[PDB]
Amino acid sequence: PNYKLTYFNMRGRAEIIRYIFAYLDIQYEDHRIEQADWPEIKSTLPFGKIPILEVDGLTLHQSLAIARYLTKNTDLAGNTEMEQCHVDAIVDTLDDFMSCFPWAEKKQDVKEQMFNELLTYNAPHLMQDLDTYLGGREWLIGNSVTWADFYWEICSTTLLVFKPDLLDNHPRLVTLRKKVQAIPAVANWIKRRPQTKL
Amino acid sequence: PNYKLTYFNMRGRAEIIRYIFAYLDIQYEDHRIEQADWPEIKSTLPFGKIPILEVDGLTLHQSLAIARYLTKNTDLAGNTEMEQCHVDAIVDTLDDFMSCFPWAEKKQDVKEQMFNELLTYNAPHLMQDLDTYLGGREWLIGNSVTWADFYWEICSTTLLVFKPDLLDNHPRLVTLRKKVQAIPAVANWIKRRPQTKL
Ligand SMILES: Cc1cc(-c2csc(Nc3ccc(C(=O)O)c(O)c3)n2)ccc1F
Ligand SMILES: N[C@@H](CCC(=O)N[C@@H](CS)C(=O)NCC(=O)O)C(=O)O
Ligand SMILES: N[C@@H](CCC(=O)N[C@@H](CS)C(=O)NCC(=O)O)C(=O)O
Ligand SMILES: [Mg+2]
Numbered sequence: 001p002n003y004k005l006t007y008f009n010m011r012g013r014a015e016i017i018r019y020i021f022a023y024l025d026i027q028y029e030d031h032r033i034e035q036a037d038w039p040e041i042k043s044t045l046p047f048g049k050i051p052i053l054e055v056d057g058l059t060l061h062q063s064l065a066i067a068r069y070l071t072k073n074t075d076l077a078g079n080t081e082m083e084q085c086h087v088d089a090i091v092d093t094l095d096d097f098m099s100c101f102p103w104a105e106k107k108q109d110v111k112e113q114m115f116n117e118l119l120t121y122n123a124p125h126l127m128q129d130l131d132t133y134l135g136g137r138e139w140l141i142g143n144s145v146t147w148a149d150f151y152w153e154i155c156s157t158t159l160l161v162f163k164p165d166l167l168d169n170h171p172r173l174v175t176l177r178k179k180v181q182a183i184p185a186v187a188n189w190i191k192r193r194p195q196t197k198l
Numbered sequence: 199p200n201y202k203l204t205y206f207n208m209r210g211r212a213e214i215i216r217y218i219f220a221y222l223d224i225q226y227e228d229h230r231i232e233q234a235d236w237p238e239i240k241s242t243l244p245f246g247k248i249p250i251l252e253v254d255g256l257t258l259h260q261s262l263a264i265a266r267y268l269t270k271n272t273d274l275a276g277n278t279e280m281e282q283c284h285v286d287a288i289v290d291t292l293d294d295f296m297s298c299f300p301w302a303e304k305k306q307d308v309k310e311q312m313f314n315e316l317l318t319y320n321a322p323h324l325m326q327d328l329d330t331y332l333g334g335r336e337w338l339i340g341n342s343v344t345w346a347d348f349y350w351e352i353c354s355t356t357l358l359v360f361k362p363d364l365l366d367n368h369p370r371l372v373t374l375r376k377k378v379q380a381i382p383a384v385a386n387w388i389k390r391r392p393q394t395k396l
Contacts, residue, residue, distance in 0.1 A: 047291055047327050058280065065286030072279055081270050082256075088263035093245055099297065133244050 003028035006041065007051040010196050011158065013063040014051040019150045020070045022189040028053075032194070064091060071147050079142045086141045090133075090148040094155045097126055119163040131170050140176070145183065153180040158198060201226035204239065205249040208394045209352065210301075211261040212249040217348045218268045220387035230392070262289055265345055274345045284339045288331075288346040292353045295324050301396075317361045329368050338374070343381065351378040356396060 007014035009032040053060045071077040078084035105111035205212035207230035276282035303309035
């Protein structure tokens with residue numbers, strides 16, 4: 001099909017979709033917009049939020065709804081319906097946590113203090129839960145990579161910009177990041193993609 | 199398949215699972231806990247949150263992850279792969295809004311204020327987005343009912359406890375709510391369920 005992804009020049013909420021396209025070797029236009037193109041584009045959107053994906057002219061929204069859509073009937077989705085559920089559950093747990101950050105906060109001091117609170121308390125807690133859930137197993141769910149592993153590497157990459165020692169006491173989670181990053185299609189993508197802070 | 203649902207004595211985030219169990223005529227233990235028994239159960243969980251659903255001795259988590267799992271290969275799922283994406287997208291839109299509420303805020307003044315703000319400033323815009331999106335169609339997605347329709351009815355039901363006039367300018371959305379409420383299995387559950395505020 002013909003696919004067109006629209007988001008800011010940023011990893012953010014679009015990146016999970018970018019990894020999926022890359023891993024599944026699906027071609028798409030990676031359209032990145034600047035703030036100036038936003039009000040213009042926003043008003044055409046049924047819900048006014050990005051990312052959105054247009055597939056043969058039909059517009060789709062919600063990053064995770066779209067990511068799930070793309071992994072349908074592939075091994076990335078989870079091998080059984082039970083695994084697919086654990087994949088969905090791990091993905092929302094991580095997403096619920098990232099949504100806790102005041103990404104849009106205009107007051108720099110408030111933003112800093114809130115980030116520090118979340119990274120000092122909530123983050124190490126969530127990290128112990130993920131570490132224990134993963135155990136000494138290879139991937140978060142089942143015995144092959146799923147887009148939950150993808151989401152983990154993506155969410156952690158962003159949290160590490162702000163608290164670089166976040167995984168210093170979690171070697172098993174660092175190992176998971178490296179396994180994901182080393183998947184050839186993902187390793188390729190990570191090298192080609194635009195460099196942006198978020 | 200034995201099913202045991204654990205959550206507080208309220209509709210809250212467990213309700214979507216309850217509507218699905220009813221619609222599909224599946225029997226389950228509807229376990230409702232008191233706040234004082236929570237800490238002991240929370241400590242035993244992989245991710246320390248409810249609802250959770252136990253099936254055959256495995257604890258699933260994330261209300262939507264679970265809802266999506268129970269509706270897989272059922273008529274409550276979208277009818278096409280794309281429709282399944284729209285079902286997911288609408289559920290996440292509704293969920294992103296409900297998640298903004300400080301449900302567990304101890305400071306009553308701060309809580310009331312955040313509630314007033316969201317209900318007064320944000321809720322109306324969501325109702326506009328949803329009303330336009332529904333348009334003149336019979337259900338949110340496609341030609342038949344999906345669990346997105348259930349989630350709409352569930353979210354709108356709790357928003358209406360706080361802002362009864364929310365849908366005065368949205369008759370098509372009240373017609374949709376009434377439509378969901380009229381589904382025999384849903385109607386039965388609505389009449390039968392414990393009557394709680396939230
Ligand atoms: C449909 C839907 C419902 C809710 C919801 C209503 S009450 C609650 N949780 C609460 C409320 C109060 C308390 C409490 O303080 O005891 C608590 O622990 C949890 N959550 C949230 C999102 C959503 F999409
Ligand atoms: N849960 C949604 C979040 C979408 C969202 O809030 N997108 C942001 C960009 S990260 C946005 O458009 N906000 C700016 C605006 O609404 O103008 C998703 O994952 O797609
Ligand atoms: N996105 C999650 C939210 C889960 C959640 O935060 N549940 C709340 C109650 S609604 C909870 O377990 N709160 C008690 C606590 O966090 O200790 C879901 O849909 O299940
Ligand atoms: Mg969500």
